[PDB]
Amino acid sequence: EALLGVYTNVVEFVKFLETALAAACVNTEFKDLRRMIDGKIQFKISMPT
Amino acid sequence: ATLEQRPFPYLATEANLLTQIKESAADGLFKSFQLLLGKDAREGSVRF
Amino acid sequence: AMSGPAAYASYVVRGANLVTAVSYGRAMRNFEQFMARIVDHPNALP
């Protein structure tokens, strides 16, 4: 019997790491954010003169 | 008045002096490991 | 065009074996190489 034509859309898929916004971030593969002390990652600044 | 009527009255008055002694949240604890971002991974990156 | 890493940066646990047999001869050899780097390369420090 006669044929039938099927045309599907093709969508480009987004990965966050490939987009150039990730130059504004350090991306860290991490496992366990539940183990953190609240409201505190201290970092010490020493400015020479 | 609620400090004395609670049981274990000596350990209650000693454990409630922590709000005076504590200054940083890692005070009484020891240090065991270091989670680097790599092998040295910066002087400026976040070390756990 | 620009370049980057393939995946997210994973953490590495360092500090498991502390080896505590550190000697005086090797510590002075490490200290002479460490103080020479301030004159040699102030920004690149091991």
B-chain residue closest to C15, CA distance: B33
CA dihedral for B5, B10, B15, B21, sign (positive or negative):
positive
Q: Which amino acid belongs to residue B29?
A: L
Q: Specify which residues B8 forms β-bridges with.
A: none
Question: Which method was it determined by?
Answer: cryo-EM
Q: Compute the distance between CA of residue A38 and CA of residue A16 in angstroms, rounded to an integer.
A: 27
**Would the CB atoms of C8 and A20 count as touching at under 8 Å?**
no
Q: Compute the distance between CA of residue A30 and CA of residue A36 in angstroms, rounded to an integer.
A: 12
Q: Compute the distance between CA of residue A27 and CA of residue C10 in angstroms, rounded to an integer.
A: 9
> Given the structure tokens 């890692």, which residue do they identify?
B26
Q: Compute the distance between CA of residue A45 and CA of residue A25 in angstroms, rounded to an integer.
A: 21
CA A38-A23-B44 angle, 5° bins: 50
| Strand-pair category, A28-29 with B34-36 | unpaired
Asked if A41 reaches chain B (Cβ–Cβ under 8 Å), the answer is: yes
Q: Residue C35: is it exposed, middle or buried by C-beta count within 10 angstroms (0-12/13-18/19+)? A: exposed
- Residue B48's nearest CA partner among A33, A12, C22 is A33
The pair phi, psi for residue B14, each rounded to 5°, is: -95, -35
Q: What resolution in angstroms, rounded to 1 decimal?
A: 3.7
Q: Compute the distance between CA of residue A13 and CA of residue A28 in angstroms, rounded to an integer.
A: 22
Q: Which residues of chain A does B37 touch, with a Cβ-Cβ cutoff of 8 Å?
A: 26, 28
> Given the structure tokens 């505190």, which residue do they identify?
A40
CA distance A14 to chain B (A): 26
Instruction: Give SS3 for B18.
Output: helix
- DSSP H or E segment with residue A38: none
CA distance C31 to chain B (A): 19
**Would the CB atoms of C9 and A20 count as touching at under 8 Å?**
no
